[PDB]
Scaffold this motif. Sequence first.
Motif, PDB file in Angstrom:
ATOM      1  N   UNK A   1       0.826  -1.202   0.000  1.00 28.57           N
ATOM      2  CA  UNK A   1       0.000   0.000   0.000  1.00 28.57           C
ATOM      3  C   UNK A   1       0.864   1.256   0.000  1.00 28.57           C
ATOM      4  N   UNK A   2       2.127   1.099  -0.390  1.00 27.75           N
ATOM      5  CA  UNK A   2       3.105   2.179  -0.335  1.00 27.75           C
ATOM      6  C   UNK A   2       3.862   2.152  -1.654  1.00 27.75           C
ATOM      7  N   UNK A   3       3.860   3.270  -2.383  1.00 26.42           N
ATOM      8  CA  UNK A   3       4.138   3.265  -3.813  1.00 26.42           C
ATOM      9  C   UNK A   3       5.635   3.339  -4.102  1.00 26.42           C
ATOM     10  N   UNK A   4       6.107   2.473  -4.998  1.00 23.53           N
ATOM     11  CA  UNK A   4       7.410   2.604  -5.635  1.00 23.53           C
ATOM     12  C   UNK A   4       7.204   2.854  -7.120  1.00 23.53           C
ATOM     13  N   UNK A   5       8.153   3.550  -7.740  1.00 23.86           N
ATOM     14  CA  UNK A   5       8.103   3.735  -9.188  1.00 23.86           C
ATOM     15  C   UNK A   5       9.512   3.986  -9.695  1.00 23.86           C
ATOM     16  N   UNK A   6       9.982   3.137 -10.597  1.00 27.24           N
ATOM     17  CA  UNK A   6      11.316   3.268 -11.171  1.00 27.24           C
ATOM     18  C   UNK A   6      11.216   4.074 -12.458  1.00 27.24           C
ATOM     19  N   UNK A   7      12.087   5.067 -12.605  1.00 27.76           N
ATOM     20  CA  UNK A   7      12.029   5.949 -13.766  1.00 27.76           C
ATOM     21  C   UNK A   7      12.964   5.483 -14.876  1.00 27.76           C
ATOM     22  N   UNK A   8      14.239   5.248 -14.576  1.00 22.36           N
ATOM     23  CA  UNK A   8      15.220   4.933 -15.606  1.00 22.36           C
ATOM     24  C   UNK A   8      16.041   3.719 -15.207  1.00 22.36           C
ATOM     25  N   UNK A   9      16.192   2.786 -16.143  1.00 24.85           N
ATOM     26  CA  UNK A   9      17.087   1.643 -16.010  1.00 24.85           C
ATOM     27  C   UNK A   9      18.179   1.820 -17.051  1.00 24.85           C
ATOM     28  N   UNK A  10      19.417   1.980 -16.600  1.00 23.93           N
ATOM     29  CA  UNK A  10      20.515   2.269 -17.509  1.00 23.93           C
ATOM     30  C   UNK A  10      21.666   1.316 -17.238  1.00 23.93           C
ATOM     31  N   UNK A  11      22.171   0.695 -18.302  1.00 24.00           N
ATOM     32  CA  UNK A  11      23.238  -0.293 -18.208  1.00 24.00           C
ATOM     33  C   UNK A  11      24.579   0.411 -18.350  1.00 24.00           C
ATOM     34  N   UNK A  12      25.294   0.539 -17.239  1.00 20.20           N
ATOM     35  CA  UNK A  12      26.629   1.116 -17.253  1.00 20.20           C
ATOM     36  C   UNK A  12      27.638   0.013 -17.532  1.00 20.20           C
ATOM     37  N   UNK A  13      28.865   0.401 -17.856  1.00 17.88           N
ATOM     38  CA  UNK A  13      29.913  -0.570 -18.111  1.00 17.88           C
ATOM     39  C   UNK A  13      31.250  -0.040 -17.622  1.00 17.88           C
ATOM     40  N   UNK A  14      32.061  -0.945 -17.090  1.00 14.85           N
ATOM     41  CA  UNK A  14      33.427  -0.659 -16.692  1.00 14.85           C
ATOM     42  C   UNK A  14      34.353  -1.536 -17.519  1.00 14.85           C
ATOM     43  N   UNK A  15      35.439  -0.952 -18.014  1.00 15.68           N
ATOM     44  CA  UNK A  15      36.336  -1.628 -18.943  1.00 15.68           C
ATOM     45  C   UNK A  15      37.529  -2.178 -18.180  1.00 15.68           C
ATOM     46  N   UNK A  16      37.861  -3.438 -18.442  1.00 11.59           N
ATOM     47  CA  UNK A  16      38.982  -4.117 -17.825  1.00 11.59           C
ATOM     48  C   UNK A  16      39.816  -4.769 -18.922  1.00 11.59           C
ATOM     49  N   UNK A  17      40.845  -5.509 -18.504  1.00 10.93           N
ATOM     50  CA  UNK A  17      41.706  -6.183 -19.471  1.00 10.93           C
ATOM     51  C   UNK A  17      40.929  -7.210 -20.285  1.00 10.93           C
ATOM     52  N   UNK A  18      40.080  -8.002 -19.628  1.00  8.19           N
ATOM     53  CA  UNK A  18      39.350  -9.037 -20.340  1.00  8.19           C
ATOM     54  C   UNK A  18      38.318  -8.483 -21.301  1.00  8.19           C
ATOM     55  N   UNK A  19      37.618  -7.429 -20.897  1.00  3.12           N
ATOM     56  CA  UNK A  19      36.574  -6.859 -21.722  1.00  3.12           C
ATOM     57  C   UNK A  19      35.802  -5.785 -20.990  1.00  3.12           C
ATOM     58  N   UNK A  20      34.477  -5.844 -21.052  1.00  2.91           N
ATOM     59  CA  UNK A  20      33.622  -4.860 -20.407  1.00  2.91           C
ATOM     60  C   UNK A  20      32.835  -5.521 -19.284  1.00  2.91           C
ATOM     61  N   UNK A  21      32.876  -4.918 -18.099  1.00  3.33           N
ATOM     62  CA  UNK A  21      32.105  -5.386 -16.956  1.00  3.33           C
ATOM     63  C   UNK A  21      30.860  -4.525 -16.823  1.00  3.33           C
ATOM     64  N   UNK A  22      29.701  -5.157 -16.930  1.00  2.00           N
ATOM     65  CA  UNK A  22      28.434  -4.458 -17.026  1.00  2.00           C
ATOM     66  C   UNK A  22      27.772  -4.359 -15.661  1.00  2.00           C
ATOM     67  N   UNK A  23      26.984  -3.304 -15.493  1.00  2.00           N
ATOM     68  CA  UNK A  23      26.260  -3.070 -14.258  1.00  2.00           C
ATOM     69  C   UNK A  23      25.016  -2.265 -14.587  1.00  2.00           C
ATOM     70  N   UNK A  24      24.065  -2.288 -13.663  1.00  2.00           N
ATOM     71  CA  UNK A  24      22.785  -1.625 -13.831  1.00  2.00           C
ATOM     72  C   UNK A  24      22.568  -0.601 -12.733  1.00  2.00           C
ATOM     73  N   UNK A  25      21.996   0.530 -13.127  1.00  2.00           N
ATOM     74  CA  UNK A  25      21.640   1.610 -12.224  1.00  2.00           C
ATOM     75  C   UNK A  25      20.136   1.804 -12.308  1.00  2.00           C
ATOM     76  N   UNK A  26      19.487   1.931 -11.155  1.00  2.00           N
ATOM     77  CA  UNK A  26      18.028   1.863 -11.090  1.00  2.00           C
ATOM     78  C   UNK A  26      17.480   3.029 -10.285  1.00  2.00           C
ATOM     79  N   UNK A  27      17.342   4.181 -10.927  1.00  2.00           N
ATOM     80  CA  UNK A  27      16.802   5.345 -10.240  1.00  2.00           C
ATOM     81  C   UNK A  27      15.328   5.114  -9.943  1.00  2.00           C
ATOM     82  N   UNK A  28      14.980   5.067  -8.662  1.00  2.00           N
ATOM     83  CA  UNK A  28      13.603   4.832  -8.258  1.00  2.00           C
ATOM     84  C   UNK A  28      13.165   5.958  -7.337  1.00  2.00           C
ATOM     85  N   UNK A  29      11.863   6.212  -7.333  1.00  2.00           N
ATOM     86  CA  UNK A  29      11.237   7.164  -6.435  1.00  2.00           C
ATOM     87  C   UNK A  29      10.202   6.404  -5.623  1.00  2.00           C
ATOM     88  N   UNK A  30      10.284   6.517  -4.302  1.00  2.00           N
ATOM     89  CA  UNK A  30       9.332   5.892  -3.396  1.00  2.00           C
ATOM     90  C   UNK A  30       8.488   6.994  -2.773  1.00  2.00           C
TER      91      UNK A  30
END
Length: 169
Positions: A1-30
């Motif tokens: 009964x208490x509202x959450x709402x996510x606005x943007x899901x964006x896939x960030x990446x960090x570069x290493x020797x092997x390749x790209x290490x991916x991560x997700x950022x989840x801006x939410x408003x409660x």
Amino acid sequence: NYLERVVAINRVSKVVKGGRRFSFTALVIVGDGNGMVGVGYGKAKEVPAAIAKGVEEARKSFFRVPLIGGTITHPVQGEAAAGVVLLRPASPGTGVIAGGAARAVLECAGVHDILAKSLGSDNAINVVHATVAALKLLQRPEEVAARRGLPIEDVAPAGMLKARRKSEA
RNA sequence: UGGAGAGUUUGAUCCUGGCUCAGGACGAACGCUGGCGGCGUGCUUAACACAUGCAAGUCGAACGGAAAGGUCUC
Ligand SMILES: [Mg+2]
Ligand SMILES: [Mg+2]
Ligand SMILES: [Mg+2]
Ligand SMILES: [Mg+2]
Ligand SMILES: [Mg+2]
Ligand SMILES: [Mg+2]
Ligand SMILES: [Mg+2]
């Protein structure tokens, strides 16, 4: 009964020797839907994990939003890192009018009546930062009166004066 | 009594910054389609050339006159 709402899901990446290490950022408003709203950024390797982290750190970043019954007390302009969001209180009929990133934050804060306009950066995170800054700038008649030393009636306009008690009878 | 944004520069980011899109309007045109009614509306280009018809007429209580109708007649 208490509202959450996510606005943007964006896939960030960090570069290493092997390749790209991916991560997700989840801006939410409660938000409760009446006066309580918080914004969380949230980061994790997985989309729902980032959702959860954002929710958990948004619920510890709370602040009261001063309303008068569906609209804000007075108009403001929040200025983020580079986001600019302008808020104008609306007549008790016309509902929420806002852009994608702002709309979620003010709906979670629970306003029903507002004019919102994004004038600065279009990045969602900085837009919500600007809107939050505007809600900090928001002030209440009953504490502006204490700030100024004069009573309620000679600081607040008669319109919002008579429009207050129409909610709680 | 009134204001919405989205995509796109990067491995990822945030700005700046253009470009594109989501809306509305036409004296409109073209594609497909198509029942009617009401009310509006129709050369936005060649102030280019015009066949054909009408679109400025009126008064016998202003006058000289009798072309037609009907009359008084032979
Ligand atoms: Mg600035
Ligand atoms: Mg810009
Ligand atoms: Mg570049
Ligand atoms: Mg790319
Ligand atoms: Mg842009
Ligand atoms: Mg047809
Ligand atoms: Mg008709």
